[PDB]
């Protein structure tokens, strides 16, 4: 199966995330990818959990990229979660204008999956 932090980060589950990052293991588990390449910062924002992705940024998570080369802005833009890209832009304003392995930005990924309410916020 998957890690206890990768389980807690994608299903909301706030007090379990705060407790796993409180342990002695909770220093190198925060930046660990899975077989798809996603850190807990990727899966928390792909699923649109906006107060779990904030605690991962107060503890200083690194902005790595998965096997497709996407940052947490582009994964949340594919899913149309508007409140979690207004928070990631307020603390990292340089993830908006980035590309991936296929060269697509966040406006490219929000139109491939028909997310009209994000396009008005991405622009």
């Amino acid at each position: 199966n998957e890690s206890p932090l990768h389980f807690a980060a994608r299903y909301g589950r706030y007090n379990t995330v705060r407790q796993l990052l409180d342990s002695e293991k909770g220093s190198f588990i925060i930046n660990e990818s899975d077989g798809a390449g996603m850190t807990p910062l990727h899966i928390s924002s792909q699923q649109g959990h906006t107060r779990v992705v904030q605690l991962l940024l107060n503890r200083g998570a690194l902005l790595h990229r998965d096997h497709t080369g996407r940052n947490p802005l582009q994964l949340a833009a594919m899913s149309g979660y508007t409140e979690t890209i207004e928070l990631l832009h307020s603390v990292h304003s340089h993830l908006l204008d980035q590309v991936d392995k296929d060269g697509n930005t966040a406006l490219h990924l929000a139109t491939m999956e028909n997310k009209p309410h994000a396009i008005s916020v991405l622009m």
């Binding site: 199966n1 998957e2 206890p4 389980f7 299903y11 909301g12 589950r13 706030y14």
Partner: protein, 41 residues
Amino acid sequence: YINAELERQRRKLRDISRMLEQQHHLVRLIVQKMEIKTEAD
């Protein structure tokens, strides 16, 4: 009659879509606050 029944099914699919988004918020809330002891990994 075709234009007065296609217009009726458009209002019905809007009610199904709004009921299903209010329910998807609650199902997603349950897994955030569900108690997991025996089946914990």
